[PDB]
Amino acid sequence: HMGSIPITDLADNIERLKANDGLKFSQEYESIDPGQQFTWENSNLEVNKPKNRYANVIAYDHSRVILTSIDGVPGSDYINANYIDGYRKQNAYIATQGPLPETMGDFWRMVWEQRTATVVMMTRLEEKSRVKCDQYWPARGTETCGLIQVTLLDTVELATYTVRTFALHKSGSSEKRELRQFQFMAWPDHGVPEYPTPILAFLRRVKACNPLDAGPMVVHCSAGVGRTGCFIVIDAMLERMKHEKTVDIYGHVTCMRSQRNYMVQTEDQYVFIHEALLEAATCGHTEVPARNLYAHIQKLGQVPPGESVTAMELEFKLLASSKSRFISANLPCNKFKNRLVNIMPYELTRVCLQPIRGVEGSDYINASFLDGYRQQKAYIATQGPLAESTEDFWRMLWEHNSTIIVMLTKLREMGREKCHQYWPAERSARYQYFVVDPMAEYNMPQYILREFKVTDARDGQSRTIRQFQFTDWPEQGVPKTGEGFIDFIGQVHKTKEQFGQDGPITVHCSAGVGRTGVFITLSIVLERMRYEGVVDMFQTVKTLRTQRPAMVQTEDQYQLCYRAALEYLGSFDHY
Amino acid sequence: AKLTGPGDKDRRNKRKHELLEEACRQGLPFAAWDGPTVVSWLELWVGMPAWYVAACRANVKSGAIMANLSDTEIQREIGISNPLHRLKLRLAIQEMVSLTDMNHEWVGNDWLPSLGLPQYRSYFMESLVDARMLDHLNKKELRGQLKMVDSFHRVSLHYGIMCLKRLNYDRKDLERRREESQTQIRDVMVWSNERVMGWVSGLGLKEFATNLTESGVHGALLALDETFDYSDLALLLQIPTQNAQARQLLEKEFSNLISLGTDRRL
């Protein structure tokens, strides 16, 4: 809509814009017009032209960020950057290009002079062997970029974003300023993200850490118009929603085009903004600090007025509400490789094997890559191996350097197979290219640990693969307490750390979604609670479901996650 | 960490020193310790995984039994089939008897990369190799279990260990010595792989310095091995043979390095 929309009508509006191959979306996006002419005299100056990453992306004169002049040096006031208004906030952002090797000093000096506390980087340094931006911060210690001395204090690497803390010093001054950088890691090499869940997390983190009394926030990507634009408009519209419960995307992008050229430079980006805000409007706010977890769970077990079920159930239903992605899984040659014919990996996040010449679908296995708290592809979530897929299962662990397995079922339960015994028990076994030797087996109260020596028969290299099998999961329902399971999650991850196993952790139950979801969800939530003191269950499961369908399959499994988190909390000091 | 508890690093570290203090205060020799006493010792001071300490809790009733446990008895009562894990244990119980930090995490995350041997991190840590075990490593244990098939890497490793012995295994002293030699060409025996790469790029060879990563080149090797000359280093830098200027700067500067910062006879 070419104007304000109440969030309740947002989904319907997006549907209308999407209709007829998104004809309405195109017409609207193409009509965006500031309706005035601008000048860019400073950007075209011979001395400033090399300071533009793209000659055709310039800084309008009225809104450009002006640096102080350095005596004797023409063009000292120039950097390719413009102020951008936020929601009811003037010059709230600074959109800039990712600095060139020779404007890094200018870039930092802009940060100083504008009294910026937060820099937002919407790109990786290199995407598909193409340079999108040059690294402008020191990897370690202190570097001098022009007049500014930049010191790296702290780094925190999470799956989709990285936070760096710097201390700034300007030459000739004793003043010290702090600056945090937020780098987004989950924007694809081409097009827009498939899901808005990660970007929304990033924004929430940034809003949380950007001081209310700072200069304008610097946002940059490549040219500073595309991803930068998307970040800025979503951030502004999230604030508008918080205050008015309406959005005016078309209005805000129009105003933004008056401050810098091409803000939101493709239509798919314009659509992505709409979809992101629809998700935010729909999901509410689900984070709760540890201090409030008890009361929160009590509250979820209540039935809201005018409803029929608990808030817990409604919250769980909502996880499913945010819905041709199974391409390889439906190929005739691969259908028998799925233990359940309706539980398949997403094409984008599935784990791929090296293809074998002449064998169609030899690259397929029902398995997905799942993100951890700190890194992507930290878990492989897969089904309980079939006898048909056992050879492939061993090949996956080898090709992806996975040396820790987690089994969450018995071989048979309730009279039916949950998992094939894919491992040797008493003597060696050869599984196509691989020889697996039973090394040891240790029985613990609630789990069993099996160690194997796997050998590639092709070159003779060998690895120790370890399997942790959980034996105390009831064959009907869920554990009454999470005490044993939490300890299990601790032991699996303690082992990964203590033995320096860098690869992914392969997790399986039957279809690879129910108990596996609970394992992985709790692995992330419990660590995040320990380090950040907060719990976002809904967001954690919802993120997982964007990487493999139906993670955490039933409500009692979801109830379990909450229950276990509260129990883990009880083992801390305040609690 | 926003939330703190008894599972933290410093909490387990203090409890470790407190149980030890309790042991040496009460006066009990190692052979006199209780069942519960030796199993809390296995978790906290030795750092064994839970499945080992479970088998110990069920099969070892006193420190006397533990001390006299033969190699094959360890395998069946504690459940340790891993030979390097056994070694970790025999050296642990041996150290305690004779007495009545630098663990495998340090070896894996700090020491090994400074030798320019980060690749072997996984295997050393999986085998729980602490500093105490380093001199006790067989050729068989290095080749097979720790995957060091390259003989030079075993040599590189060898001179790394010799350097530690020269310094009486004092990590604080080692780190200090490294700090004071960052800007000068003195005492290169303590130089890390970084420092050596840092030395090489200082000669004007920035384009080859990165090739020393995972090369096993470190200061202790340069300083303690007489068979190692500039030519050895030259091909580890992957310097073209036809490149005569480079093999001149290197040769001259390698001579300055050894002459000024070692006690080698060249």
Side-chain angles (χ1 to χ4, degrees), chain A residues 1-29 31-127 129-575, chain B residues 1-7 11 13-15 18-20 22-264 266:
Chain A
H1 186 243
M2 297 183 191
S4 175
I5 314 176
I7 60 176
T8 60
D9 293 314
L10 184 49
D12 192 17
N13 270 263
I14 296 181
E15 282 301 311
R16 291 187 183 90
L17 290 170
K18 276 199 170 99
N20 305 7
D21 249 342
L23 174 66
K24 254 66 177 307
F25 246 135
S26 295
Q27 291 175 346
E28 179 176 301
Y29 174 74
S31 80
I32 297 176
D33 195 345
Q36 49 182 319
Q37 265 56 41
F38 311 98
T39 65
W40 47 95
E41 293 187 348
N42 290 276
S43 287
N44 271 2
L45 291 185
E46 177 164 345
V47 76
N48 289 340
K49 277 181 181 172
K51 304 177 186 181
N52 302 330
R53 182 173 293 278
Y54 298 79
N56 52 326
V57 173
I58 45 82
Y60 293 153
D61 287 322
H62 70 293
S63 60
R64 76 183 181 100
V65 177
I66 308 167
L67 310 177
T68 61
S69 306
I70 301 182
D71 304 285
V73 187
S76 306
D77 60 326
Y78 184 81
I79 175 162
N80 195 314
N82 296 84
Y83 296 110
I84 310 287
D85 293 352
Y87 171 73
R88 256 107 145 129
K89 299 196 293 183
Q90 13 280 4
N91 305 327
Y93 314 91
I94 292 181
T96 178
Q97 71 185 16
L100 296 161
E102 41 276 300
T103 77
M104 278 170 196
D106 295 337
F107 177 84
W108 283 114
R109 189 160 70 96
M110 177 187 63
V111 173
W112 182 273
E113 290 181 3
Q114 296 303 308
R115 305 175 188 275
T116 291
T118 309
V119 174
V120 180
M121 177 171 185
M122 291 295 309
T123 182
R124 284 127 58 205
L125 291 175
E126 179 179 8
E127 296 174 354
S129 303
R130 184 194 150 190
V131 172
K132 301 299 291 311
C133 173
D134 300 86
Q135 176 170 340
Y136 56 91
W137 64 89
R140 58 184 299 262
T142 301
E143 287 184 0
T144 296
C145 303
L147 309 179
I148 308 300
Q149 201 174 354
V150 183
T151 297
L152 177 59
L153 297 176
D154 185 38
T155 301
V156 181
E157 281 177 58
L158 296 189
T160 75
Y161 64 90
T162 296
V163 188
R164 301 182 182 82
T165 296
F166 305 93
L168 301 187
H169 289 95
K170 184 177 146 68
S171 65
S173 172
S174 64
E175 187 174 358
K176 179 163 88 62
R177 295 181 185 171
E178 287 194 346
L179 175 100
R180 281 194 279 278
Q181 185 210 37
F182 295 82
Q183 181 177 10
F184 188 66
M185 303 296 284
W187 199 291
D189 293 4
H190 301 291
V192 305
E194 268 217 317
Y195 298 96
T197 310
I199 182 79
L200 287 179
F202 185 71
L203 279 141
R204 258 158 27 207
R205 177 68 190 275
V206 173
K207 285 189 174 195
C209 290
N210 187 46
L212 306 179
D213 67 327
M217 215 194 301
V218 161
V219 191
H220 79 82
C221 46
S222 190
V225 301
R227 305 181 186 184
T228 302
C230 290
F231 177 88
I232 293 177
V233 45
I234 300 173
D235 196 74
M237 290 306 101
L238 279 175
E239 294 186 7
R240 172 164 178 155
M241 280 172 47
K242 180 179 175 179
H243 181 233
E244 320 182 9
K245 294 175 182 180
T246 70
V247 286
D248 190 9
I249 302 167
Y250 179 82
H252 193 253
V253 179
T254 300
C255 172
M256 284 175 63
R257 293 276 186 82
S258 279
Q259 294 177 283
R260 185 164 172 89
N261 43 201
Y262 319 129
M263 297 304 286
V264 182
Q265 64 173 341
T266 76
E267 191 190 305
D268 57 26
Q269 285 176 350
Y270 188 67
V271 180
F272 178 73
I273 291 150
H274 283 71
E275 275 161 0
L277 291 167
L278 179 54
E279 173 163 318
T282 294
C283 293
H285 313 265
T286 56
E287 183 168 302
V288 39
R291 184 212 313 160
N292 299 329
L293 189 58
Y294 181 93
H296 188 224
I297 297 176
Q298 297 303 300
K299 191 76 176 300
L300 286 174
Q302 192 182 358
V303 180
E307 295 295 345
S308 303
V309 294
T310 59
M312 181 84 64
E313 183 161 348
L314 294 178
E315 171 168 307
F316 187 70
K317 296 283 214 309
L318 190 60
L319 285 171
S321 293
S322 180
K323 282 190 155 191
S324 67
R325 296 192 197 262
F326 322 109
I327 311 168
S328 297
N330 278 331
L331 290 186
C333 59
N334 292 330
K335 282 214 86 196
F336 75 95
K337 303 184 188 177
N338 303 318
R339 181 176 283 281
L340 296 188
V341 294
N342 294 342
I343 304 298
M344 296 167 168
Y346 291 142
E347 189 64 36
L348 280 203
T349 44
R350 75 180 184 89
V351 186
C352 300
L353 311 179
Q354 292 306 299
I356 306 177
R357 296 196 299 267
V359 200
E360 293 182 355
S362 53
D363 74 328
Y364 179 84
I365 177 159
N366 190 315
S368 304
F369 277 119
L370 268 64
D371 290 350
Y373 179 57
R374 302 188 175 272
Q375 78 181 8
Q376 298 183 96
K377 306 194 329 183
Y379 301 101
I380 298 180
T382 177
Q383 66 185 16
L386 305 158
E388 305 79 299
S389 61
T390 293
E391 289 180 352
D392 292 332
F393 178 78
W394 287 105
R395 204 165 115 243
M396 180 187 75
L397 305 184
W398 189 273
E399 287 183 15
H400 293 289
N401 298 274
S402 180
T403 62
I404 294 174
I405 309 172
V406 172
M407 179 173 185
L408 301 169
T409 55
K410 297 181 181 73
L411 293 174
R412 303 186 67 88
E413 295 184 9
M414 293 291 155
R416 291 184 162 108
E417 170 170 304
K418 288 278 185 172
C419 179
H420 176 84
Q421 180 165 335
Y422 51 86
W423 70 89
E426 296 172 344
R427 60 186 184 187
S428 297
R430 190 176 182 181
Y431 301 96
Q432 198 49 61
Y433 313 102
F434 301 103
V435 174
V436 187
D437 293 333
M439 287 287 96
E441 178 167 330
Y442 312 83
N443 298 265
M444 299 288 301
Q446 299 198 38
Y447 67 91
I448 300 166
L449 168 65
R450 300 179 181 91
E451 295 180 349
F452 304 94
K453 182 188 172 182
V454 185
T455 311
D456 190 341
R458 291 171 294 187
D459 51 18
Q461 297 197 92
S462 63
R463 309 174 190 173
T464 300
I465 278 69
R466 293 181 178 82
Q467 179 209 31
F468 291 80
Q469 183 191 6
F470 191 73
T471 62
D472 208 18
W473 197 291
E475 298 184 9
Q476 282 183 266
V478 300
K480 301 297 182 176
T481 50
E483 183 179 4
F485 197 60
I486 291 166
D487 171 76
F488 178 69
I489 299 174
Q491 288 300 319
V492 173
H493 287 92
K494 184 194 179 184
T495 298
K496 174 192 181 296
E497 193 184 23
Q498 292 296 316
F499 287 161
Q501 307 306 288
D502 297 323
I505 291 172
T506 303
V507 185
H508 65 83
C509 57
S510 55
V513 294
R515 304 180 187 182
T516 294
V518 175
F519 180 90
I520 303 177
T521 299
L522 285 180
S523 301
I524 297 171
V525 162
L526 295 188
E527 190 175 2
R528 186 163 184 258
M529 191 196 320
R530 187 239 273 237
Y531 281 87
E532 298 187 43
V534 299
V535 173
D536 205 331
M537 201 65 64
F538 181 87
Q539 284 298 314
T540 304
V541 176
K542 188 175 198 310
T543 302
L544 289 187
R545 290 199 178 179
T546 71
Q547 301 173 87
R548 182 171 175 88
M551 301 305 284
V552 181
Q553 209 168 16
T554 60
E555 181 195 327
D556 44 335
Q557 283 174 352
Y558 191 64
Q559 264 268 348
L560 178 61
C561 288
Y562 272 114
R563 180 147 33 101
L566 183 51
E567 294 183 348
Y568 184 54
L569 182 59
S571 80
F572 283 97
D573 289 347
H574 177 315
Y575 325 90
Chain B
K2 186 130 295 89
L3 298 189
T4 57
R11 287 280 222 101
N13 202 37
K14 188 173 182 180
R15 183 179 63 185
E18 282 168 346
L19 278 183
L20 257 191
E22 186 58 37
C24 298
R25 196 272 309 162
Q26 191 157 320
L28 286 189
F30 180 79
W33 294 4
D34 315 333
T37 307
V38 303
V39 301
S40 59
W41 171 73
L42 262 195
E43 280 192 31
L44 274 62
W45 205 80
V46 186
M48 293 305 209
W51 44 95
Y52 289 173
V53 315
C56 172
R57 188 176 183 175
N59 298 335
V60 173
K61 305 189 290 186
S62 72
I65 311 299
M66 173 78 70
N68 307 333
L69 227 53
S70 74
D71 172 83
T72 183
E73 283 180 6
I74 293 178
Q75 179 151 9
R76 55 186 189 89
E77 297 207 23
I78 305 176
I80 306 179
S81 59
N82 189 324
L84 285 181
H85 290 189
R86 292 206 305 272
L87 175 59
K88 189 188 185 68
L89 183 56
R90 287 192 302 274
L91 294 184
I93 70 181
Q94 176 183 352
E95 203 184 20
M96 273 290 97
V97 172
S98 296
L99 285 187
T100 61
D101 203 332
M102 305 171 303
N103 58 332
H104 67 97
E105 293 190 7
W106 175 79
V107 175
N109 300 327
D110 282 338
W111 189 64
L112 226 41
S114 76
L115 300 185
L117 292 176
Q119 325 96 264
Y120 300 101
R121 173 184 178 269
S122 310
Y123 314 103
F124 274 71
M125 296 191 64
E126 181 210 336
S127 309
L128 301 180
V129 181
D130 53 48
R132 196 189 308 107
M133 302 162 54
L134 287 175
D135 200 280
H136 297 70
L137 294 179
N138 291 331
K139 178 180 177 183
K140 179 175 184 175
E141 296 163 342
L142 291 183
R143 289 269 303 167
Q145 197 166 2
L146 296 179
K147 258 65 181 173
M148 289 202 311
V149 290
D150 196 333
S151 71
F152 173 67
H153 289 175
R154 297 197 304 277
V155 171
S156 181
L157 185 73
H158 179 66
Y159 284 112
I161 299 176
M162 209 187 276
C163 168
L164 292 186
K165 295 193 289 184
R166 292 289 186 91
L167 271 56
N168 282 278
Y169 294 97
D170 195 351
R171 175 183 172 183
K172 294 175 187 180
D173 191 26
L174 173 68
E175 300 178 333
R176 192 201 78 240
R177 194 105 134 251
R178 266 169 189 179
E179 291 177 30
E180 301 172 357
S181 62
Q182 288 299 298
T183 63
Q184 300 165 340
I185 313 189
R186 299 212 276 271
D187 184 64
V188 311
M189 183 194 57
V190 185
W191 287 17
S192 72
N193 186 247
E194 267 192 351
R195 181 65 181 89
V196 173
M197 292 191 282
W199 173 73
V200 172
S201 60
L203 310 177
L205 303 182
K206 179 187 177 181
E207 62 175 337
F208 291 113
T210 61
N211 294 335
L212 290 185
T213 59
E214 310 190 358
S215 65
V217 173
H218 54 85
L221 176 133
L222 303 165
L224 298 172
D225 193 12
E226 284 88 347
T227 66
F228 193 96
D229 60 322
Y230 90 104
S231 307
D232 300 340
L233 179 62
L235 72 104
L236 280 176
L237 285 166
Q238 296 182 13
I239 288 181
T241 57
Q242 66 265 21
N243 197 328
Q245 179 195 23
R247 295 186 172 262
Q248 173 174 359
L249 295 179
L250 186 61
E251 177 173 26
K252 289 185 176 181
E253 293 305 304
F254 186 76
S255 300
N256 278 5
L257 181 69
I258 282 189
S259 305
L260 293 177
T262 76
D263 297 342
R264 268 183 63 177
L266 189 71

